Design an enzyme around this catalytic site. Structure first.
Site, short mmCIF file in Angstrom:
data_model
loop_
_atom_site.label_atom_id
_atom_site.label_comp_id
_atom_site.label_asym_id
_atom_site.label_seq_id
_atom_site.Cartn_x
_atom_site.Cartn_y
_atom_site.Cartn_z
N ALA A 30 0.83 -1.19 0.00
CA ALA A 30 0.00 0.00 0.00
C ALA A 30 0.87 1.26 0.00
CB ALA A 30 -0.90 -0.01 1.20
N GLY A 32 3.94 1.45 -1.69
CA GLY A 32 4.63 1.52 -2.96
C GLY A 32 4.99 0.15 -3.54
N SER A 33 5.47 0.16 -4.78
CA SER A 33 5.99 -1.02 -5.46
C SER A 33 7.43 -0.84 -5.80
CB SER A 33 5.28 -1.23 -6.77
OG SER A 33 3.91 -1.33 -6.50
N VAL A 34 8.13 -1.94 -6.02
CA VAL A 34 9.55 -1.92 -6.23
C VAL A 34 9.91 -2.77 -7.46
CG1 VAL A 34 11.82 -2.43 -5.15
CG2 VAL A 34 9.92 -1.57 -3.77
N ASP A 160 13.71 0.98 5.86
CA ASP A 160 12.43 1.58 6.36
C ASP A 160 12.49 2.20 7.78
OD1 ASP A 160 11.51 0.31 3.93
OD2 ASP A 160 9.66 -0.36 4.78
#
Ligand SMILES: COc1ccc(N(C(=O)Nc2ccccc2Cl)c2ccnc(N[C@@H](C)C(C)(C)O)n2)cc1
Length: 334
Positions: A30, A32-34, A160
């Site tokens: 939710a 982001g994408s990588v 993170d």
């Protein structure tokens, strides 16, 4: 300004500079994408994270701005840092996507399926990164295996962290049970949990929920003596602990039977209920267990980090403009 190109990866759109080639999806959230990519400028493999909806609310916005600020600041070998940040936007007005780029890391530690000198090296590097983050007055708050990235070479980076921003298995009892004035040592608890589980191959405290989590923790570390009990402000919590049939502190040698006793002793210093009594990251690095790795001349601390923004209650456009500024002002690492 470089030239961009679009493609569509697994439900999501991606507009990245030509510098980055061969995007392959690698994970998602939710948040982001990588994608892994190839960075034609350096020859290195990199990871590009597209934030999902960076400015969809004032809290998404503020989070976006938090993440960017934190990352622009993190300059340590054991901490994820920022190779690049970019937007396809050519103005603040069209600004609605943020991409972040860092070195690509092969795997995380929940994936890893260890020996003593492996445990030594991995924990040494987490502590070395944590010493740095803690010195900027940042608390990670969610250290767990899935947040620690590692190559086959066993080089490790924390992902993170910071700064505001089951997981419950690695959470310190004080943060769990809502004693909301913790300190940085919450992270030292998580590190003890991670280390316990690398040496042992199982989760130290697999709670099915927060109450059960706490019961498992008290089983090993014992219920607080009056000394810790008197620092607990909430009669809710105090009474619950004072409702729990008493339990003694187990000897860590028995529970971590067959483990290097120097690891057993480090764990004992990390896994104390009283966070005023928990070893810190700098102290831990000087402990005998890391004699093969410790070097007081190569455990750097951070430049001071302005997180005043954290108390600010601003508008979406305000957080968005601040994020844009940060993007513009980015200075690549050499
Ligand atoms: C500053 O910009 C970035 C760029 C990429 C990331 N990143 C992730 O966020 N990955 C990740 C995190 C949670 C869940 C799934 C994934 Cl794929 C990275 C960074 C480096 N290497 C990875 N590798 C993936 C394959 C991992 C091993 C973490 O699963 N992910 C971090 C910061």
């Amino acid at each position: 300004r470089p030239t961009f190109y679009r493609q569509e990866l697994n439900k999501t759109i991606w507009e990245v500079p030509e510098r980055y080639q061969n995007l392959s999806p690698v994970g998602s959230g939710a948040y982001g994408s990588v994608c892994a990519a190839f960075d034609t400028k350096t020859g290195h493999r990199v990871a590009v994270k597209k934030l999902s909806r960076p400015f969809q609310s004032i809290i998404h916005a503020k989070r976006t701005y938090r993440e960017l600020r934190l990352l622009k600041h993190m300059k340590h070998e054991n901490v994820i840092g920022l190779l690049d940040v970019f937007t396809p936007a050519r103005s603040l007005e069209e600004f609605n996507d943020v991409y972040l780029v860092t070195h690509l890391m092969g795997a995380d530690l929940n994936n890893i399926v260890l020996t003593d000198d492996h445990v030594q090296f991995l924990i040494y590097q987490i502590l070395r990164g944590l010493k740095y983050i803690h010195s900027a007055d940042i608390i990670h708050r969610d250290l767990k295996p899935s947040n620690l990235a590692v190559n086959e070479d066993c080089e490790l980076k924390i992902l993170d962290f910071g700064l505001a921003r089951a997981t419950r298995w690695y959470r310190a009892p004080e943060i769990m049970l809502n004693w909301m004035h913790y300190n940085q040592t919450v992270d030292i608890w998580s590190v003890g949990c991670i280390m316990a589980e690398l040496l042992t191959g199982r989760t130290l405290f697999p709670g099915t929920d927060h109450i059960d989590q706490l019961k498992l923790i008290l089983r090993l570390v014992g219920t607080p003596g009056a000394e810790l009990l008197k620092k607990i402000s909430s009669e809710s919590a105090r009474n619950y602990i004072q409702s729990l049939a008493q339990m003694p502190k187990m000897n860590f040698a028995n529970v971590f039977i067959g483990a290097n006793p120097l690891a057993v002793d480090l764990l004992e210093k990390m896994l104390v209920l009283d966070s005023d009594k928990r070893i810190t990251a700098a102290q831990a690095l000087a402990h005998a267990y890391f004699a093969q790795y410790h070097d007081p001349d190569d455990e750097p601390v951070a430049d001071p980090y302005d997180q005043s923004f954290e108390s600010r209650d601003l508008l979406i456009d305000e957080w968005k403009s601040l994020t844009y500024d940060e993007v513009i002002s980015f200075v690549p690492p050499p």
